[PDB]
């Protein structure tokens, strides 16, 4: 009777777009783990030696995204980024953190 994820989004990658950007991408969990419909994803980022260092999170993502652009982050900035599933019942376990770094370089 269990109605949410039991695993994680899948292939979890992160690209540094730019100086403030960070694109996410995630494949969904296998689908006997899901329990149920995902209805949206949520990813959840650190920066690991910034100046806020609090945990952010962009929720409701909607089912049919593969990935997601991070934006207003701080420069040369390293963030721990997680992704996870939810069914309309309730949020599924993130992902193992994927390290990325902001930097000055920006990709064309």
């Known amino acids: 009777a269990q109605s949410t994820p039991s695993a994680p989004p899948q292939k979890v990658m992160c690209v ?3 100086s403030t950007t960070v694109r996410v991408s995630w494949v969904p969990p296998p689908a006997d ?3 149920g ?3 949206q994803y ?3 980022y650190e920066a690991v030696d910034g ?3 609090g945990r952010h999170v962009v929720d409701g993502i909607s089912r049919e ?3 997601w652009d991070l ?3 701080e420069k040369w900035t390293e963030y721990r980024v997680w992704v996870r599933a939810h069914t309309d019942v309730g949020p599924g376990p993130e992902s193992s953190p994927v390290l990325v770094r902001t930097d000055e370089a920006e990709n064309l």
């Open 16 to 18: 540094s777009m730019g």
């Open 33 to 35: 783990s899901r329990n």
């Open 37 to 39: 419909v995902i209805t």
């Open 42 to 44: 949520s990813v959840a």
């Open 51 to 53: 100046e806020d260092r």
């Open 65 to 67: 995204h593969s990935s």
């Open 71 to 73: 934006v207003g982050l």
